[PDB]
Amino acid sequence: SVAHGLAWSYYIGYLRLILPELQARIRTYNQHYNNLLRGAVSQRLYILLPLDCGVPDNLSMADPNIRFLDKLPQYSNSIYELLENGQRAGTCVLEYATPLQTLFAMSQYSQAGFSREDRLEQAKLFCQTLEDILADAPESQNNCRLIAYQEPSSFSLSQEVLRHLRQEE
Amino acid sequence: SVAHGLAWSYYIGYLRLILPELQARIRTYNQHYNNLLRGAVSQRLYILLPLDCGVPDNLSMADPNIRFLDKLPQYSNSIYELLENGQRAGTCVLEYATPLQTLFAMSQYSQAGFSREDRLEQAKLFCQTLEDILADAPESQNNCRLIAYQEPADDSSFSLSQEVLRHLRQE
Ligand SMILES: [Ca+2]
């Protein structure tokens, strides 16, 4: 199954390299660059895992309640404000799990012999494998949170992130 | 096994995106940028696949007979000259298969429970899977050559430049 290699590549080649300095970079931002009133950026890296593997080109312009705030100083990571009831309800470092783009592309390539059913199953296995790797990983010190979801009826991505953000604090 | 996902990620996220424009970039370089008094760059992307997963940070430090010439204009790809008997024997776009660095890193990470034997098996599977993908792939139009190799225990019986040259001469 492709999910196993995708989760290991993502952890080894990316997460284990960015997670150790993440809390220091967020701290730097909150203390020296953040001008929001009671808008401290949450301490975890929030990873969007749409199980449908639909990764847009621009995160921000996919939900009006998710607005780009700043680049996280010191790799390119972005800070977003999350709105609820028309007001800022939270701020976090947020991004899509790029290996889902591979699963989407494989389902779009007839020679891969990879159905939408195979894609959904591998997306769930990728999530489960990555969760398992991070649970045993020394770099993951209350540093990373996976946000896996499916669409049902309108969907609110901001509400999904906020439920995880509130689970932190 | 990790090799399947690594091969598919490498093809989807890299090879299929770079290979369609490769021939045009090489042709542009040979016509407009290459020095007048030197060889034309060969037309394929040569991918080094050491089965031991030993990927160097440069490429030249692995062999004095492989010398950096230029960056290929228009994704960062590099052109190298290959030497044989101290002289220029070929010129090509060359690079290591970066997913082998994942296999190497997993073998050093105790929590992965991934031995050197497991790493070698996955390196072979990665090569076989990638070859199978490329064989059926539309982007691969006499555009890519995988160079997989096992390094013998006797150092004197293997030369990386000689391995690239055998494939370059096959072209
Ligand atoms: Ca030896």
UniProtKB/Swiss-Prot annotation, chain A:
Expression across tissues: Ubiquitously expressed. Expressed in skin endothelial cells, alveolar type 2 pneumocytes, bronchial epithelium and alveolar macrophages.
Result after altering residue 13 to S: Slight decrease in c-di-GMP-binding
Residues at which 2',3'-cUAMP binds: 14, 98
Localisation: Endoplasmic reticulum membrane; Cytoplasm, Perinuclear region; Endoplasmic reticulum-Golgi intermediate compartment membrane; Golgi apparatus membrane
Cytoplasmic topological domain residue ranges: 2-169
Outcome of swapping residue 77 to A: Strong decrease in c-di-GMP and cGAMP-binding
Post-translational modification: Phosphorylation by TBK1 leads to activation and production of IFN-beta. The phosphorylated pLxIS motif constitutes an IRF3-binding motif, leading to recruitment of the transcription factor IRF3 to induce type-I interferons and other cytokines. The phosphorylated pLxIS motif facilitates SENP2 recruitment during late phase of viral infection. Phosphorylated on tyrosine residues upon MHC-II aggregation.
Consequence of changing residue 101 to I: Renders the enzyme sensitive to 5,6-dimethylxanthenone 4-acetic acid (DMXAA) drug, leading to activation of the STING1 pathway
Region (Cyclic dinucleotide-binding domain (CBD)): 2-169
Keywords from the named record: Autophagy, Cell membrane, Cytoplasm, Cytoplasmic vesicle, Disease variant, Endoplasmic reticulum, Golgi apparatus, Host-virus interaction, Immunity, Innate immunity, Ion channel, Ion transport, Isopeptide bond, Lipoprotein, Membrane, Mitochondrion, Mitochondrion outer membrane, Nucleotide-binding, Palmitate, Phosphoprotein, Transmembrane, Transmembrane helix, Transport, Ubl conjugation
Modified-residue entries (Phosphoserine), positions: 76
Additional note from the record: The cGAS-STING signaling pathway drives sterile inflammation leading to type I interferon immunopathology in severe COVID-19 disease caused by SARS-CoV-2 virus infection. Tissue damages in the lung and skin lesions are caused by activation of the cGAS-STING signaling leading to aberrant inflammation. Endothelial cell damage is also caused by activation of the cGAS-STING pathway: SARS-CoV-2 infection triggers mitochondrial DNA release into the cytosol.
Comment block on domains: In absence of cGAMP, the transmembrane and cytoplasmic regions interact to form an integrated, domain-swapped dimeric assembly. In absence of cyclic nucleotide (c-di-GMP or cGAMP), the protein is autoinhibited by an intramolecular interaction between the cyclic dinucleotide-binding domain (CBD) and the C-terminal tail (CTT). Following cGAMP-binding, the cyclic dinucleotide-binding domain (CBD) is closed, leading to a 180 degrees rotation of the CBD domain relative to the transmembrane domain.
Name of the protein this chain belongs to: Stimulator of interferon genes protein
Lineage of the organism: Eukaryota, Metazoa, Chordata, Craniata, Vertebrata
